[PDB]
Write a protein that binds this ligand. Sequence first.
Ligand code: HEM
Ligand code: HEM
Ligand SMILES: [Cl-]
Length: 105
Amino acid sequence: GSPELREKHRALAEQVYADGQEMLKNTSNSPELREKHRALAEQVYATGQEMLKPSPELREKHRALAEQVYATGQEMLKNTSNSPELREKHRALAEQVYATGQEML
Ligand code: HEM
Ligand code: HEM
Ligand SMILES: [Cl-]
């Protein structure tokens, strides 16, 4: 429907992934970086919704996984330090979101 919106979503997704990976490599991240990631997360989520307004079952899966990853991140917003356990459970989920989005491409 709108390729411009799809590519905005993609580019935002890429940037979420980069600071995610960047943040993974540090025991403590500045609030600036943590906030960039999460503002970007908010905008990929928003652009994804905008597109719902491939197959329906694949979009459904991706959407459900997005919500789960976003809800997971919100819990991490309350923590000055997120542990390996938390950080890796979030990474695993986020990986499934990326995969399913790429499966639609
Ligand atoms: C929030 C985290 C999300 C991430 C990291 C994410 C990531 C991606 C990625 C990487 C793609 C493939 C883009 C490409 O390579 O061209 C994609 C496509 C897509 N995403 Fe998401 N997504 C997210 C959330 C959502 C949500 C919440 C929705 C819907 C409510 C959504 C709907 C879509 C749709 C419909 C496409 C395919 C668009 C098209 O084919 O024209 N996404 N997503
Ligand atoms: C794909 C969609 C993703 C969404 C919607 C998302 C969302 C969030 C949110 C809302 C937070 C809370 C921010 C904070 O604690 O300050 C967060 C934290 C985090 N995310 Fe993500 N994230 C995604 C992908 C990733 C990926 C792929 C990685 C790693 C490769 C990652 C690594 C992290 C890390 C390490 C934190 C914690 C930062 C810290 O404790 O200093 N995220 N994420
Ligand atoms: Cl804490």
